[PDB]
């Protein structure tokens, strides 16, 4: 999703550049109306891009935190396996001891 937003942002920038090229062509043409339409398209797109960038930054921070969390999780599962082995040995000994105690 983060990659897609970045691609979308790049596409938006490309679209703005395309509009700018059209505006330059309009200036050469000398028609005022054609140039004005291109400018309007650029402004709305720019506003959308700014909003997207802010959203992307927040999303990126969350993603980074998740990656860090995943690394911590990997350490935890490994620790659990070691704990399980210790627990199993203790349990077997305890069961045997209880039977002996009963006699």
């Amino acid at each position: 999703a983060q990659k897609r937003s970045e691609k979308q942002y790049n596409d938006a920038q490309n679209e703005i550049n395309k509009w700018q090229r059209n505006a330059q062509l309009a200036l050469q043409k000398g028609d005022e109306n054609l140039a004005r339409q291109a400018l309007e398209r650029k402004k709305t797109y720019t506003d959308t891009s700014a909003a997207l960038k802010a959203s992307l930054d927040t999303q990126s921070t969350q993603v980074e935190t998740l990656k860090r969390n995943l690394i911590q999780l990997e350490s935890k599962i490994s620790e659990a396996k070691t704990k399980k082995e210790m627990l199993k040995a203790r349990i077997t000994t305890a069961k045997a001891q209880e039977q002996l105690q009963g006699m």
């Binding site: 505006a23 200036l27 005022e32 140039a35 004005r36 400018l39």
Partner: peptide, 12 residues
């Protein structure tokens, strides 16, 4: 504003 910018480009 666009016209003014266009005029400057035309100038040179």
């Amino acid at each position: 504003d666009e016209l003014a910018a266009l005029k400057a480009q035309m100038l040179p």
